[PDB]
Design a protein around this ligand. Structure first.
Ligand code: CDL
Ligand code: PEE
Ligand code: PEE
Ligand code: HEM
Ligand code: HEM
Ligand code: ANY
Ligand code: SMA
Lengths: 61, 101, 49, 81, 380, 295
């Protein structure tokens, strides 16, 4: 059971609770930022310098 | 003409404090006079008033009221303090004007 | 007297796992806190970020 | 400073409450909750909405009556040559 | 001696008696977070403010282009700016509701707690005034030119009182500098007074919806109201950011994107929204002095409410009559505001003059009257 | 305690006053008692214990002679198992500011006679001990809580307790103090509990042990006492637990154990609270709850 397994191992000891939040935020940051940027970028395909880029970035001369 | 009566009886249901099961006098804002009145209340009539409030509060915090059945009915509201208060005021007014003499 | 006093019926509000007056709440405790604590824990991460 | 203890004299009031971990966070969302939300909304709508509604009109009105005073009255030039 | 540090320590004892063991009514509603939120606004203006001041350049020739520079060149400066600016608005929002509450639940009976409030409000208004003049845009300028001029209405000391304000004989650099210095300082004065506001309060504990002794059921500020503040924190914090992230300039006049021109008062000049209502009142009294005076009392009247209380009961919770009046008054302002945003012509002008007549009367006459009437209907 | 029980076990049977309702005592019928006797007073569940100058066999004889029960079916031989009672961390506040002192009782669910843990628990309960105005020890007592209790005139008295039952238990503490210290008191108390589940030392247990051993003995001081112990040993524990035995189980317990065990039953558990009297000062279960962790 995860809730038990979780409460018992992480949320119980006020000292481990922290490590959980820290280590957690850490993961949370990465995943979030990645998807976020993704959700955005996609909602704007072909309009960002990330898309236009190639037409001039090492293409002419 | 019951006009006046028919009206008070209205505004009463209008104010609707009785939905919290509070008595008219229960709502009085506690000023220096009332404060004294309340101190004169017999212990039963007092602990009672209090509970009535501590109940009203409990409601107001839950965002609820009393089931219609337990609402206070106009004619049954007991002006438990009205008279006490009046006296208080009277006493004062006498002390007050007596110090102008 | 104090013998005529009883804790009213709180079924209306009780969490699902402790509604039966015949089952040790103790086992389904670890869970009830794990969750509430989970929310809070998460909320922290949120804030953090 | 510390106010807990002087507050007031109270006699005979039994209160029972259960730990938060034994009860539901937002229980009876329907049977209980909402209904009261409606209950509340009701009793109050007829005190709040009236005036606002009243204004809105005075707003629409003035707004329009103004706009009409912008348009020209062809009758100022039926004499013109 | 004492057991737990939290109560003995000269400093914790304070954090304690005002954030943790503080006695709070069990029933105070949403309309009770506005105090704390107001705080948060203050904290957010001072923070963002120091930051903006780190890049501002109080000086006519550069004041504009410094802000511009501060938004374009300074890392996240734009975000700072935006936040500072809408913060202002959200500040006023929070404050107007904070006042609302006070009015409807007669918290104004805590006189001192209240009077200081007015003071705070007044200051905020002043503070926010100078703040705006800084960017030195068209509005910045002309607003500066009007608001200050208001004092030219006072006889004798008047024409002089302005002199100081501007530091010159017309609104020029000297003004801009001293105004910046002023804007920089003032916020702090508020912070201070707030400390007082809260003190006078703590003498009585907080009021509460029903308007009856709450001593029969109080609850430790923590965790109850503490958690409740954080929620109310994020809640307001949302539209604020939303507003400032997706439509920064929504609440803001764009005519202020045109550097001040001491020679051209924009044809369409209308005050920051949070001042509109007053703007209106003054605009309806066609007389320098009257206009000014109308405005004065338009806000100064707050000080009176405490004496214009007649109901045997304290809050309007049980006074349907008063209530209806109250909301009418809310809407009365909501109107006055509209008018402000509307040119000086018909119908607008008359509609205005009325609402103003409206305003004062509800406060000076109907309220105390419907109030008395009210107790006779309950039979007191 | 009845109130404590009445909420700690709310809804189930345990939550009942041994004396029962006012109505039942007002209406109970000749019959109903008659039945109670028949229904409950039965040989398999009864135990004849005796202590003093008496020959075991002689006893058993007079026993066979008057305790002549005849068991036909299997029914009259089966001991009906009891529907386990549900613990519910919560509170019950009976207020009356017009009373001299306020009484407060807090507890966590207990294991039940069976559990070998009960030992440990009692060892713990020996560390926090009990205090009361008249103890001459005063500011010097070895019980942490007792000390502070004295130092700051915390309570008029306080006491540890591990009331056990067949299937459950009520581990906690009860103190009585002036309306204006209830808080500080509780606070120090709950602290001790926390300290128990976190930093109990070897020296702390060493003593408790020696203290416990003594009460262990003092419970067996005379005839009645012994007989009681036996009457109750067989009835709850199954057989008879000798002092030689009890003692081993105690010399066993050490720090690590106490910590683990108390933690096991006290840490971050929702407790039961019972308040009676002029209790304004102590407030919010939430807050009391929070006093269950860190420490
Ligand atoms: C989230 C909002 C709460 C929704 C609600 O009304 O609950 C009804 C209902 C609970 O019903 P209830 O028990 O009768 O209501 C209890 C309280 O009203 C439940 O509400 P509460 O007392 O727990 O929360 C109060 C909260 C609620 O605030 C709101 O009403 C929003 O107000 C605040 O904390 C203050 C924040 C104010 C800042 C707003 C910024 C203004 C800027 C304007 C531009 O919740 C649901 O139906 C569940 C929704 C999922
Ligand atoms: C790289 C990745 C990023 C790294 C982030 C840095 C990590 C920072 C370390 C944070 C340490 C957190 C540990 C706190 C533990 C305290 C505690 O006792 O628990 C939380 C404790 C409550 O206790 P319980 O939930 O009842 O249960 C206890 C568990 N048995 O406190 C709480 O109420 C937690 C709520 C926290 C959220 C509140 C903040 C909300 C604010 C939102 C606005 C955000 C934006 C603006 C911020 C800018 C500020 C300049
Ligand atoms: C100032 C110029 C700026 C323009 C004005 C901004 C006005 C904003 C529009 C109004 C938005 C608020 C939403 C309306 C809320 C409706 C509502 O909830 O009403 C019912 C509710 C129930 O009351 P009880 O009887 O106690 O019930 C308890 C038991 N259940 O009443 C309340 O919440 C109380 C009213 C709160 C105050 C809101 C006032 C709005 C602000 C206007 C400023 C007024 C003050 C004048 C200052 C002079 C400068
Ligand atoms: C920088 C200024 C201000 C801040 C940040 C502030 C802060 C507070 C705080 C924290 C509270 C307690 C929480 C609450 O009741 O909302 C409070 C209460 C109060 N404030 Fe303000 N306030 C400000 C402005 C004002 C103004 C302008 C008024 C009106 C003149 C005012 C009137 C009151 C009153 C009457 C109370 C009592 C509230 C009650 O009945 O509980 N405040 N204020
Ligand atoms: C009471 C809180 C404050 C209010 C009400 C407030 C309001 C304002 C306003 C309305 C502006 C004009 C912004 C715009 O162009 O839209 C402004 C500008 C400015 N404020 Fe504040 N301010 C406050 C506190 C502060 C603080 C704490 C400082 C520093 C002591 C500060 C520094 C500045 C600076 C440098 C500007 C110029 C840059 C800009 O225009 O954004 N402000 N302020
Ligand atoms: C550091 C420790 C000192 C802490 C001081 C701050 C404080 O005491 O914060 C509290 C939460 C206070 N709020 C209240 O008392 C309060 C009262 C009733 C209801 C609610 N909320 C919901 O019902 C409250 O939030 C509140 O809003 O005051 C700030 C204004 C103070 O900040 C200032 O005065 C500064 C600008 C300076
Ligand atoms: C250095 C400090 C000094 C001299 C003190 C300043 C004192 C003034 C008050 O502060 C409390 C003031 C902010 C407050 O008055 C009560 C406001 C409601 C006044 C609102 C106001 O705004 C205007 C404005 O913003 C404009 O610009 C776009 C233009 C304006 O007309 C052309 C006005 C205007 O006609 C009014 C009445």
């Amino acid at each position: 059971a995860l809730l038990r397994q979780a409460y018992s191992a992480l949320f119980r000891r006020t000292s481990t609770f922290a490590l959980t939040v820290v280590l957690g935020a850490v993961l949370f940051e990465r995943a979030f930022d990645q998807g976020a940027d993704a959700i955005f970028e996609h909602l704007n395909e072909g309009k960002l310098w990330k898309h236009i880029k190639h037409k001039y970035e090492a293409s002419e001369e | 003409g019951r006009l006046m009566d028919r009206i008070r009886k209205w505004y009463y249901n209008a104010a609707g404090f009785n939905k919290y099961g509070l008595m008219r006098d229960d709502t009085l804002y506690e000023d220096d006079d009332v404060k004294e009145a309340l101190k004169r209340l017999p212990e039963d009539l007092y602990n009672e008033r209090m509970f009535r409030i501590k109940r009203a509060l409990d409601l107001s915090l839950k965002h609820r009221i009393l089931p219609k059945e337990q609402w206070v009915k106009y004619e049954e509201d007991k002006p438990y303090l009205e008279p006490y208060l009046k006296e208080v005021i009277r006493e004062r007014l006498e002390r007050e004007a007596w110090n102008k003499k | 007297v104090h013998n005529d006093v009883t804790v009213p019926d709180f079924s209306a509000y009780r969490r699902e796992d402790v509604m039966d007056a015949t089952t040790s709440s103790q086992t389904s405790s670890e869970d009830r806190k794990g969750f509430s604590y989970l929310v809070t824990a998460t909320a922290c991460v949120a804030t953090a970020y | 400073g510390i106010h807990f203890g002087n507050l007031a004299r109270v006699r005979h009031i039994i209160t029972y409450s259960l730990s938060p971990f034994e009860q539901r966070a937002i229980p009876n969302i329907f049977s209980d909750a909402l209904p009261n939300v409606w209950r509340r909304f009701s009793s109050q709508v007829f005190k709040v909405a009236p005036p606002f509604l009243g204004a809105y009109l005075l707003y629409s009105w003035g707004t329009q009556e103004f706009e009409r005073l912008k348009r020209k009255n062809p009758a100022d030039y039926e004499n013109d040559q | 001696m004492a057991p737990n540090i939290r109560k003995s320590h000269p400093l914790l004892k304070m954090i304690n008696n005002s954030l943790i063991d503080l006695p709070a009514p069990s029933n105070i509603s949403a309309w009770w977070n506005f105090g704390s939120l107001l705080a948060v606004c203050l904290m957010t203006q001072i923070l963002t403010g120091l930051l903006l001041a780190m890049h501002y350049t109080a000086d006519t020739s550069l004041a504009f282009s410094s802000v511009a520079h501060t938004c374009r060149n300074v890392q996240y400066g734009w975000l700072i700016r935006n936040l500072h600016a809408n913060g202002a608005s959200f500040f006023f929002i929070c404050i107007f509701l904070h006042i609302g509450r006070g009015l409807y639940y007669g918290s104004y009976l805590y006189k001192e707690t209240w009077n200081t409030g007015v003071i705070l409000l007044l200051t905020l208004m002043a503070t926010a005034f100078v703040g705006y003049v800084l960017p030195w845009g068209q509005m910045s300028f002309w607003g500066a030119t009007v608001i200050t001029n208001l004092f030219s209405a006072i006889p004798y000391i008047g024409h002089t009182l302005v002199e100081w304000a501007w530091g010159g004989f017309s609104v020029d650099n000297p003004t801009l500098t001293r105004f910046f210095a002023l804007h920089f300082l003032l916020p702090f004065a508020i912070a201070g007074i707030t400390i007082i506001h809260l003190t006078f309060l703590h003498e009585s504990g907080s009021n509460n919806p029903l308007g009856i002794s709450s001593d029969s059921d109080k609850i430790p500020f923590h965790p109850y109201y503490s958690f409740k503040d954080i929620l109310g924190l994020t809640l307001m914090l949302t539209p604020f950011l939303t507003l400032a992230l997706f439509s920064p300039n929504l609440l803001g006049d764009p005519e202020n994107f045109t550097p001040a021109n001491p020679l051209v008062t924009p044809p369409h000049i209308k005050p920051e929204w949070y001042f509109l209502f007053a703007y209106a009142i003054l605009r309806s009294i066609p007389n320098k002095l009257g206009g000014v005076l109308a405005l004065a009392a338009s806000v100064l009247i707050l000080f009176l409410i405490p004496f214009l209380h007649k109901s045997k009961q304290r809050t309007m919770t049980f006074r349907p009559l008063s209530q209806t009046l109250f909301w009418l008054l809310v809407a009365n302002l909501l109107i006055l505001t509209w008018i402000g945003s509307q040119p000086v012509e018909h119908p607008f002008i008359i509609i205005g003059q009325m609402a103003s007549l409206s305003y004062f009367t509800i406060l000076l006459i109907l309220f105390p009257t419907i109030g008395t009437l009210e107790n006779k209907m309950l039979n007191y | 305690f009845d109130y404590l029980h009445a909420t700690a076990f709310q809804g189930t049977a345990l939550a009942r006053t041994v004396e029962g309702t006012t109505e039942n005592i007002k209406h109970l019928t000749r019959a109903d008692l008659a039945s109670y006797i028949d229904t409950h007073f039965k040989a398999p569940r009864m135990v004849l214990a005796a202590a003093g100058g008496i020959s075991h066999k002689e006893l058993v004889d007079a026993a066979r002679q008057h305790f002549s029960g005849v068991s036909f079916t299997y029914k009259e031989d089966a001991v009906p198992i009891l529907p386990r009672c549900r613990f519910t961390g919560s509170e019950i506040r009976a207020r009356d500011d017009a009373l001299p002192v306020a009484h407060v009782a807090l507890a966590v669910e207990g294991p039940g006679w069976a559990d070998p843990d009960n030992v440990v628990l009692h060892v713990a309960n020996a560390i926090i001990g009990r205090y009361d105005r008249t103890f001459g020890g005063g500011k010097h007592l070895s019980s942490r809580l007792a000390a502070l209790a004295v130092e700051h005139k915390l309570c008029h008295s306080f006491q540890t307790f591990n009331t056990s039952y067949s299937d459950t238990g009520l581990f906690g503490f009860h103190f009585v103090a002036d309306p204006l210290s209830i808080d500080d008191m509780m606070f120090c108390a709950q602290g001790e509990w926390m300290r128990l589940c976190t930093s109990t030392t070897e020296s702390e247990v060493k003593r408790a042990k020696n203290h416990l051993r003594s009460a262990m003995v003092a419970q067996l001081d005379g005839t009645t006492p012994v007989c009681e112990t036996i009457g109750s040993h067989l009835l709850n524990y199954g057989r008879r637990i000798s002092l030689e035995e009890w003692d081993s189980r105690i010399s066993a317990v050490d720090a690590r154990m106490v910590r683990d065990v108390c933690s096991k039953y006290i840490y971050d558990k929702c407790p039961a609270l019972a308040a009676v009297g002029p209790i304004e000062q102590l407030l919010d279960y939430n807050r009391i709850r929070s006093g269950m962790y860190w420490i």
